[PDB]
Amino acid sequence: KDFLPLAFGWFLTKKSSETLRKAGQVFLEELGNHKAFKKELRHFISGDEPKEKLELVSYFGKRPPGVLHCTTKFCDYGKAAGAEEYAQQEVVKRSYGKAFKLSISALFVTPKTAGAQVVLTDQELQLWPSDLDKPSASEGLPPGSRAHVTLGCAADVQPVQTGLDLLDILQQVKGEAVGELPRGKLYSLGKGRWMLSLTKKMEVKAIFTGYYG
Ligand SMILES: [Cl-]
Ligand SMILES: [Cl-]
C-alpha cells in the first residue's frame, strides 16, 4: 500500500558534500595532469582522439545533481527486488533520519566512473542490504566493500556502475605506487583504472534517510 523511497542511503550535509565534491574535482584535475596518466591514455580512452591533454572534468560530464550520497538500497518505490524486505528491517526504521559519519579511504577513476571508497563501520554495515545482484560474497570480498560515493560518470554510463567499478578495483588489490599526490599515493591498476589512497581518511557527515524522485 505505502510505496517506498526511490532509494535509501546516507545523504551528506551540504557542507560535507561541497567538501568531498571539491576534493573530487581537484583529484580529477591532478590525475589528468599527471605524467603516469598521460603515458597510459591508450588504455583509458577508446578511439580517434589525438594524444594531447584529456580534461577528466569534461570526461566525467555527468555529476550528481543534488548533494552527494552513499546509496544503500535502490528501491524504485518497491519496483526493485528486495525493496520491501530491506525497508521493513528494524534497524533501517531505527536508523531512519539519524546522523552518521562516513569514512572515505580512497578516490578512484575508471573509463566509466569516478568515485570515493566508503569504509562502513560495523554499525553502518547493519544498514547494508544482503541481496544485491553481485554481492561482495559471491566475489570473495567483505560485505559492504562496494560502498561508495559517485563523483562523476561518462556520457552513456549509469551511476550504478560506480559500485561495480569499485568491486573490480578491490579485486585487483587483493603493486608498488606509481606516484604521489598531496593527499596520498597514486596506483595504476591497468585498463584505465586508477586509485588514490588517502594518507588521512576523509570523514563526512551524513543523514541516513530515503530519497523520492
Ligand atoms: Cl554539493
Ligand atoms: Cl541523530
Side-chain angles (χ1 to χ4, degrees), residues 156-173:
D156 54 18
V157 176
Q158 297 324 111
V160 200
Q161 187 63 36
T162 307
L164 298 174
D165 282 6
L166 179 57
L167 283 169
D168 184 86
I169 285 171
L170 292 178
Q171 274 295 329
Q172 287 281 320
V173 296

Side-chain angles (χ1 to χ4, degrees), residues 103-122:
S103 181
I104 309 303
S105 60
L107 312 173
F108 58 88
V109 166
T110 80
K112 284 177 168 167
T113 65
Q117 173 180 9
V118 178
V119 181
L120 297 177
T121 63
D122 286 21

